[PDB]
Design a protein around this ligand. Structure first.
Ligand SMILES: CCCCC(=O)N(Cc1ccc(-c2ccccc2-c2nn[nH]n2)cc1)[C@H](C(=O)O)C(C)C
Ligand SMILES: *[C@@H]1O[C@H](CO)[C@@H](O)[C@H](O)[C@H]1NC(C)=O
Length: 343
């Protein structure tokens, strides 16, 4: 089990002002550290956040968090469940800031809620250095859904923080699962508008090079993987279903006739196109919401290679390899044309 630690700097808070924190299981024989960002949507104004506080309070507050959690999938310590990194130091960071991990704003006389996701990540890293992170050779920042977008927004800032603090030997890398979205046209008739409003409500921050390209008022562009990815310096592995259920939901897709058939086929082709220049990627032709912390994450394969294998090949590449591929994108055009898709 992973054990809860509330942050020692109690001014780094969840939405309601309670302390943020992390769950930790140390592995003293290992120099690998996996830090995983939870997902779970976001909220973007007072009324929308008030609703979330009524029925999704664990995503806004630490007051009711349990003392332990079990690691599953890529967070499992059992070799049979996690062929990739079963011996690593494991960290699960709960998502309690409702800001896609981008905020840097405290509760105040003018602010009902605090949005501190970007500061939570920095403070977890700083407190872990005294618990063994100072001896790491690799820090993998991973996450699913809003946490996967959070990886894209924060991996280079973690790298720069460790450099400025005096730890140049730690190699920082990212793993973004189910956080790679398209700002496309809906099938029936606003996510880009909600993100734009959220950034202003949260005092949200984006990576520096991407901010300088798009400039003031246009920082919402940096929440879209295909636009922010080319600006990043740290190595990033991208995992994305070609027919992701969250993408189809915001596109208003729920005996399929010609117009919808063409829409779905075009969505898969567009997603595949955005990954052409992403050398480390895993993108199966499936309709799914399933994520990399699920216990059966080993079962899906693209071109005969599982995700745990592809991640191992990626590690080797950062020391093309014969029989050890890292770029795995399905080419078949309809959900479940890959026989290994989750049932
Ligand atoms: C063009 C941007 C696409 C990304 C996007 O709009 N997002 C928010 C969201 C919220 C709620 C739902 C949702 C609503 C009702 C019912 C089911 C779902 C759902 N959620 N997952 N599957 N279905 C979908 C997306 C991302 C996410 O959090 O996914 C963030 C990171 C920007
Ligand atoms: C605690 O966190 C706050 C908010 O990020 C920061 O301003 C402050 O300097 C921190 N205090 C210490 C002692 O690290």
């Amino acid at each position: 089990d992973l054990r809860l630690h509330l942050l020692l700097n109690t001014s780094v808070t969840c939405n309601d002002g309670s302390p943020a924190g992390y769950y930790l299981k140390e592995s003293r024989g290992s120099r690998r550290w996996l830090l995983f960002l939870e997902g779970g949507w976001y909220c973007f104004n007072r009324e929308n956040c008030d609703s979330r506080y009524d029925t999704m309070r664990r995503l806004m507050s630490s007051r009711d968090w349990p003392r332990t959690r079990t690691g599953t999938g890529i967070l499992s310590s059992q070799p049979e469940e996690n062929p990739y990194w079963w011996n690593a130091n494991m960290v699960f960071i709960p998502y309690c800031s409702s800001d896609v991990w981008s905020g840097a704003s405290s509760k105040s006389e003018k602010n009902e809620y605090a949005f501190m996701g970007a500061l939570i990540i920095q403070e977890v890293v700083r407190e872990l250095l005294g618990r063994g992170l100072s001896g790491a050779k690799v820090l993998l920042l991973a996450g699913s859904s809003a946490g996967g977008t959070g990886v894209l927004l924060n991996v280079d800032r973690v790298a720069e923080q460790l450099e400025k603090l005096g730890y140049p030997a730690i190699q920082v890398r990212g793993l973004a699962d189910s956080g790679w979205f398209l700002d496309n046209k809906q099938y029936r008739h606003a996510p880009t508008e909600a993100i734009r409003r959220g950034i202003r409500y949260w005092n949200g921050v984006v990576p520096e090079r991407c901010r300088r390209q798009f400039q003031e008022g246009e920082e919402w562009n940096c929440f879209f993987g295909y636009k922010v990815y080319p600006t990043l310096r740290s190595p990033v592995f991208v995992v994305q279903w070609l027919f992701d259920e969250a993408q189809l939901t915001v596109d208003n897709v729920h005996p399929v006739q010609e117009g919808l058939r063409l829409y779905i086929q075009n969505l898969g082709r567009e997603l595949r196109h955005t990954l052409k220049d992403v050398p480390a990627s895993f993108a199966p032709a499936c309709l799914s919401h399933e994520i990399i912390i699920r216990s059966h994450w080993t079962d899906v394969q693209v071109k005969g290679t599982s995700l745990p294998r592809a991640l191992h090949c990626w590690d080797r590449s950062l020391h093309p390899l014969k029989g050890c591929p890292v770029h795995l994108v399905d080419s078949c055009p309809w959900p479940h044309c890959n026989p290994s898709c989750p049932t």
